[PDB]
Structure 1
């Protein structure tokens, strides 16, 4: 029947979907969420053999272990075991587009397991098996006999094995197809893998049992009263003596209980559900759930006889919360949310798409530590444990159907075709049936990037009708279609419209107010964190704060999808698209996260944490005004620490208790200060600290901070007089300057400082020259490629203009002697095929004290593309261990991504001045620097810089970090000016105009000295 080539067939013999069950036979156990003797894990060592196509599978396999198979761990993705390659493709499908067909060469995974079943499981009741995740389709046999089939790689498939099993040893056989008609709805931008990658379990339920249960919570106007309503359904034989008891617990206290025999209210002319019952429990002053205070209750549903014998019990965590949209705003418990979200794919660098508790918890804590309060399940239902963790640690979740058909032309080709409605429908309905009782799920999503088709409207309506407690969203077809309650664009900019035909992306500020529009707007994806990115993040936050109906967004995305590979010598390295021979592939586009695959943070994460702070601040005189953005909690685990420092030198500091109500303000009057002992800038830095540990953070955790410049004392006092006087030696090829143990050589043919000595020690490996380019960031490259240039990409614009190839032509090199210094004057023109791109005019002035002051005035042709930077570069002979600077830090920061950095005196190991982006580029800049120290050197002025063992050339010539090699000495790039990094998207120029170096004329000045 080739069922995997027919969208009309998505399963055979599969049982209905339902919320998490465990069939406890002890109420207390269900109450406490302890393990259940009736829910067994079959995860562990199984047998596995790979085949190139289903037809190659031998019938003998059905009854006998194949001797050639191997023993492997399940769950797992077979690509991570090396059986075949995982494929990284973004939009274009990994198989020829010819629905509903798939390639005849279709990798097939033959999994099997020999296991035992207790006789008690067979003597009574029903035993079923549950596959939490099988990618992408499979047939199942038990003891040589066929059981059924299932599709949808991201929801559990269950089969009743009661009639197939025997007491003792049994053998399951699972034939998993890599490609199926289900693949057409699984075109998400991520590695394409396959296998039994989620848990396998066996669940025993009684013959007469709880088949489904739904819990709802409704409130009064002020949330001081609720009604919990539990609809319970059964399967099995009805008896008058049967009963259902629902009880609700708050910790160890039972808050309420109700019991009733089965038999629902009349529904229509034919009656009601004899097989159902709904219990209603009143709850006074309920403890409300939110991401701020995730209060939870436990509802236990007991199926039993009137005489009191327990049949079974099921249960779930309940969070009392109301989600509703009113007057254009998304409200939680009556208050308007500000979504600090992130999109998070299920990805592990070693295990592929297999998720484990430890990694989930890791993710959650880091999210919470970085001020996120929400997550979008991009773009499929997640492993069941995720929801339990979100409910308990407190995160707002967008649960999304596993439907993405991005590679179709047009995008809604399948979604508008009624033949695909059935397959789509199950991907939505079975999700709702599994997840509807989780308080953390506040919004349902119909999927992603599948245009807008009539199937979406019908499914939008199905959800609205079955579960009115949560809004429905869907971005396809222009983000504001009839299939969404929320305008939820992806990559719409703050102020800039992108008026694409049919599906424009308007400025989010403007979108809200289009004629007739009234919905709230929350970006489903924004601030594409690919590589050196997050430029302009603050612009979003500012808008979110100011506009009530701009309720936030979900950053794209949490973690880089890089995978571990091992070099010849067993050394692991980070791999991306194409790295497994996969072709066609989309290269580094699978890496877009705020953290590297191992969860180490990228520098942008700190920018996010900062902009997503929950406390806002204002300064007036000596008064600090703190405003809380919490909606429900008081700041009961927070104090404010403040410090004043003069150019990095500590002056005064202290702490104060924060006692601010949600949405309230607190005024803190700072003490009088002992004003600076001299010149410089005084800086005030405040940090909110949580003295006590929480479930998600350690004691002393820093949740927010902010700085302000206070008094500045301009220096007017002249340095003393150095009797010492520098001397000038002239030759035809060089100008030399000597001052005691110091010397400087300027090359007359080049016009550059070629060498410097301290004593007899040479200081430079390469001369000090202007630099107007940078090894391109991923945002600079966009989708451009050598075989498919995108002329619009910044990198192509700079290349085309000759920026990377321009050569310096000397126009002037002169030396003069002053009263107390030597003055060298140079001028160079950088040209390309006749055009003058840039002009750099400088003076170097060496005085009696051995300080070299460099003045630089650059002209940039108004018609050449704006340069990536205006600076100087050189390779220093020395390699020192630390780098110390007075400027913004300590982490890497760029013009459009420096809000989170703070001005102070920082000092780090040289290696931390390099950011290890998997795809290498210009990195590690620190801006607003007034002083830099390295080895015996000192540079003063107002510049940006980076310092590391890699030349810009090497960074741009190398595609993978593991391949970089530390060069001799240290490369120093000191910029008077540097272009923003952008990031609103990574496929079109995204650096805002105010961050492009379009001034035409630029000036900067630096002092270089040795200590």
Structure 2
């Protein structure tokens, strides 16, 4: 009947013989074990070495497999995705379905994974009670056999599927056979923007329950107006024979102290004309002055639910962590424990570069520590229920969670084709209902989400109301169909900009500030997705946070996203490298769009992470005279693990410093008076830097952790002293092809045909490998490119506008190149025009003044045609002959920063190895810029002025021609790009131009000056 019914092509069949969903069970038979959350003898892991065989279609699986192991099969670790073992290719596609859109049908060629296990079952498990098997995650559908006999079927890749094996098992040795289909009717609701994989990728376990058992339990906490009193309400359901002697005790523990306890027989209150639930009981416990749960202080109690006889014989105990907190929306504000939240959120997919979509405790803990260390307090489970341990860790470490149903139909046309179709309501309903049934007792879950990018259909409205009816304790959100539909309590747009409207027909993305005040609108706004962190991105991040802080009903958002979905591949030499879409032969694919993270797949931070940390700081600062004002944005805690370090420096030279403990009440202010600082010995700018340091280690951070910082300019003393007049005069030598200038052991050469400095000598060693030339382009960022491809041009993308205008191929044409000998200097004057097919794009006019001190002063004046697309940069570049170890600069750093992403950077004296001056984005682009730089040092060279720079072994050309970082080769010498001006990087999204007007180079005329010397 199995191959004949084809249940994986029927949205009316999502399971067969599957047990009801429920909160995490362990069936403890000792109450103390339940309290302490120790392992349970009744819950066994079936994880480890299994048997696996791959087949092209279910029709190709031999019947012998049901009863006997296939000799050709391999021994593989489970949980796993079989693409990660190389059995077939993972596919990266974004919107377009990885299969033909023909609901409910999938392809006849349907990769089929045949898993099997031979394992022991102890006799005690079969004499009495119930033995069930739990598959936490199977992608995407499966049939189950036990000892050759058919058990059942399950769909939904992201929630547990449980089956009763009581009648199927024998004492001693048993064999499970699992046939896992890659594609099913379930796949139509699983079109998330991620790698498409398959297999048994979450834990497998056996659970023993007594016949008379706790089958469900719900925990609720309600409060008085000031949260000084709480009632814990626990509804408990049983299965088995009802008996007068049966009791439930719910006890609440704070550590080893029992705080409250309730005991009752079964039999609920009257519900309707037919009575009540005889198989249910509700316990109500009073808690005075409850310690409240939040992301700031994740206070937890332990609830123990004991099923027992009147006389005190335990039948079984279940348990959970309890966080006392109230989530509600009032007067248009999302409140936690009566206070308005500011969501410092991030979207997080379950991704490992080696193990695919299999999650482990270590990786989960790594992510949480990094999140909190970078001032995140919230996470969205994009876009499916997570591995059950995730919620446990969010409960205990303290993160707000949006729990999201595994429903995404992005690739449908229109997007709501299935979600507005009542035929798909049953499949949809199970993805929502079984999520709520599983996760409703986790305090970390504060908001339910109906899924992602599935338009808005009537099925959403029905399921929205279902959740509101079953769980009034949490708001329900959903972005589909324009982010403010009748199926959402929160306006939750994706990539809506701060000030700029994007008025798409039917689904406009209004300016978030404007959206709040639309006629009739009263809801809070929290972006489900914003600041698309794809490659060199997060430009304009500060603009969001300024708006979040100014507007009460702008309550933050979730960054897209946490971790690059790159996968490890190996080259001919067995060296690992990071791969994206298309690198596995997968086609169609969406290339590097799988990498949008604040961190690399191995959890190394992108530069953007520090900008997020700084903007999401919990302390705000103002300076007035000698007074620093510190304001706390904590809602609940006092600053009892914080001290303020202050430092004053003159152009990087430390002048004074000190510490002051912070004592700020939540949302309070502290004034700190700086001591009178002695005036500087010399000329320059004084800078004040403050840092908030955490003296003590926490559960989530080490001692000395810096949580916040800020900088101000103090007094500036402008240099008025003239440099000592030298007695030497540079000597000009002229040929037909060159102007040469000599001073001591120094020599400069200007090519009279090109009009550029072609060479410089110190002693008689060449300093340049490539002449010093103007540069108006950059190796395009992911944001510059957008969705543009060679086969499908998007003429609107910045890269295509520059290409079509001829920016990348425009050649310098010399207009003027003269030399004059002065009193104590040689003056070279040049003029160039960059042209494309008769059109002059840019004009550059320069003077180079070389004096008797050996300093070369370069003055640059650029004109940009008003009708050419604004250029990516206005600067100079050259390839230096020198390769030096260190890069030393006075400017913004230490990390990579761009004009619209530099708030996190501090002005100071920085010194890094050359390799740190390059950011290894997996898709190579312009990278490693540092802005606001007044002095740059590299080997013998020093440049002074007010510029942006990057410096590395890779030319802009190589960066733009190479599609993977592992294929980059260090070039001879060092490429230096020194810009007077550089365009913003953008990132509000990565599929339309997102660089704000104020960060585009539109001024028409530009001026900058540089001094080049040897030190």
- Please give the TM-score of this superposition, normalised by the length of structure 1: 1.00
Q: Distance in 1 between matches of 2:262 and 2:882?
A: 78
Deviations 1:275-321 (A, max 9, x none): 00000000000000000000000000000011110000000000000
Which residue does the alignment assign to 2:148?
A: 144
Structure 1 residue 482: Cα displacement: 0.1
Q: Distance in 2 between matches of 1:746 and 1:387?
A: 66
Deviations 1:90-111 (A, max 9, x none): 0000000000000000000000
One of 222, 225, 228 as aligned partner of 2:229: 225
Which residue does the alignment assign to 1:69?
A: 73
Structure 1 residue 78: Cα displacement: 0.1
3-state DSSP class of the match of 2:547? helix
Q: Distance in 2 between matches of 1:720 and 1:738?
A: 20
3-state DSSP class of the match of 1:883? strand
Q: Distance in 1 between matches of 2:279 and 2:99?
A: 46
Deviations 1:534-561 (A, max 9, x none): 0000000000000000000000000000
Deviations 1:717-767 (A, max 9, x none): 111111111110011100000000000000000000000000011000000
3-state DSSP class of the match of 2:465? helix
One of 222, 240, 244 as aligned partner of 2:244: 240
Structure 1 residue 74: Cα displacement: 0.1
Deviations 1:40-88 (A, max 9, x none): 0000000000000000000000000000000000000000000000000
1:358 aligns with 2:362: yes
Structure 1 residue 822: Cα displacement: 0.1
Q: Distance in 1 between matches of 2:857 and 2:242?
A: 94
Q: Distance in 1 between matches of 2:661 and 2:949?
A: 38
Q: Distance in 2 between matches of 1:437 and 1:615?
A: 32
3-state DSSP class of the match of 2:485? coil
Structure 1 residue 928: Cα displacement: 0.1
Q: Distance in 1 between matches of 2:122 and 2:1013?
A: 81
Deviations 1:167-216 (A, max 9, x none): 11000000000000000000000000000000000000000000000000
Structure 1 consecutive aligned stretches of length 4 or more whose deviation exceeds 6 Å? none
Deviations 1:221-268 (A, max 9, x none): 000000000000000011110110000000110000010010000000
3-state DSSP class of the match of 1:483? coil
3-state DSSP class of the match of 1:610? helix
Q: Distance in 2 between matches of 1:40 and 1:726?
A: 85
Gaps of 5+ in 2: none
Deviations 1:959-993 (A, max 9, x none): 00000000000000000000000000000000000
3-state DSSP class of the match of 1:81? coil
3-state DSSP class of the match of 1:828? strand
Residues 479-494 of structure 1 aligned to structure 2 (within 5 Å)? 479-494=483-498
3-state DSSP class of the match of 2:84? helix
3-state DSSP class of the match of 2:812? strand
Structure 1 residue 461: Cα displacement: 0.1
Structure 1 residue 8: Cα displacement: 0.1
Structure 1 residue 642: Cα displacement: 0.1
3-state DSSP class of the match of 2:83? helix
3-state DSSP class of the match of 2:365? helix
Q: Distance in 2 between matches of 1:676 and 1:447?
A: 60
Q: Distance in 1 between matches of 2:91 and 2:464?
A: 32
Q: Distance in 1 between matches of 2:723 and 2:980?
A: 25
1:371 aligns with 2:375: yes
Q: Distance in 2 between matches of 1:49 and 1:569?
A: 29
3-state DSSP class of the match of 2:70? coil
1:288 aligns with 2:292: yes
Q: Distance in 2 between matches of 1:896 and 1:801?
A: 25
Structure 1 residue 568: Cα displacement: 1.1
Deviations 1:832-873 (A, max 9, x none): 000000000000000000000000000000000000000000
Q: Distance in 1 between matches of 2:262 and 2:935?
A: 72
Q: Distance in 1 between matches of 2:822 and 2:282?
A: 96
Q: Distance in 2 between matches of 1:755 and 1:569?
A: 40
Q: Distance in 1 between matches of 2:204 and 2:883?
A: 54
Gaps of 5+ in 1: none
Deviations 1:87-140 (A, max 9, x none): 000000000000000000000000000000010000010000000000000000
Deviations 1:414-439 (A, max 9, x none): 00000000000000000000000000
Q: Distance in 1 between matches of 2:797 and 2:42?
A: 59
Q: Distance in 2 between matches of 1:600 and 1:256?
A: 45
Q: Distance in 1 between matches of 2:128 and 2:688?
A: 72
3-state DSSP class of the match of 2:318? strand
3-state DSSP class of the match of 1:443? strand
Which residue does the alignment assign to 1:277?
A: 281
3-state DSSP class of the match of 1:718? coil
One of 921, 924, 945 as aligned partner of 2:925: 921
Aligned residues: 1011
Structure 1 residue 769: Cα displacement: 0.2
Q: Distance in 2 between matches of 1:350 and 1:495?
A: 41
3-state DSSP class of the match of 1:538? helix
3-state DSSP class of the match of 2:395? helix
Q: Distance in 2 between matches of 1:649 and 1:343?
A: 41
Structure 1 residue 921: Cα displacement: 0.1
Residues 387-536 of structure 1 aligned to structure 2 (within 5 Å)? 387-536=391-540
1:965 aligns with 2:969: yes
Structure 1 residue 465: Cα displacement: 0.2
3-state DSSP class of the match of 2:430? helix
1:755 aligns with 2:759: yes
Q: Distance in 2 between matches of 1:322 and 1:513?
A: 27
Residues 752-831 of structure 1 aligned to structure 2 (within 5 Å)? 752-831=756-835
3-state DSSP class of the match of 2:884? coil
Deviations 1:395-416 (A, max 9, x none): 0000000000000000000000
3-state DSSP class of the match of 1:288? coil
Deviations 1:930-983 (A, max 9, x none): 000000000000000000000000000000000000000000000000000000
Q: Distance in 2 between matches of 1:863 and 1:1003?
A: 19
3-state DSSP class of the match of 1:465? helix
Q: Distance in 2 between matches of 1:66 and 1:740?
A: 83
Q: Distance in 2 between matches of 1:212 and 1:305?
A: 18
Which residue does the alignment assign to 1:259?
A: 263
Residues 127-138 of structure 1 aligned to structure 2 (within 5 Å)? 127-138=131-142
Deviations 1:778-829 (A, max 9, x none): 0000000000000000000000000000000000000001100000000000
Structure 1 residue 607: Cα displacement: 0.1
Q: Distance in 1 between matches of 2:893 and 2:468?
A: 49
Deviations 1:663-688 (A, max 9, x none): 00000000000111010000000000
- Please give the TM-score of this superposition, normalised by the length of structure 2: 1.00
Q: Distance in 1 between matches of 2:902 and 2:680?
A: 27
Q: Distance in 1 between matches of 2:653 and 2:936?
A: 16
Q: Distance in 2 between matches of 1:1003 and 1:920?
A: 30
3-state DSSP class of the match of 1:459? helix
Deviations 1:862-908 (A, max 9, x none): 00000000000000000000000000000000000000000000000
3-state DSSP class of the match of 1:533? coil
1:642 aligns with 2:646: yes
Structure 1 residue 573: Cα displacement: 0.2
Structure 1 residue 626: Cα displacement: 0.1
How large is the RMSD of aligned CA atoms in angstroms?
0.2
Deviations 1:134-166 (A, max 9, x none): 000000000000000000000000000000000
Q: Distance in 2 between matches of 1:718 and 1:852?
A: 16
Structure 1 residue 588: Cα displacement: 0.2
Q: Distance in 2 between matches of 1:294 and 1:1010?
A: 57
One of 142, 153, 156 as aligned partner of 2:157: 153
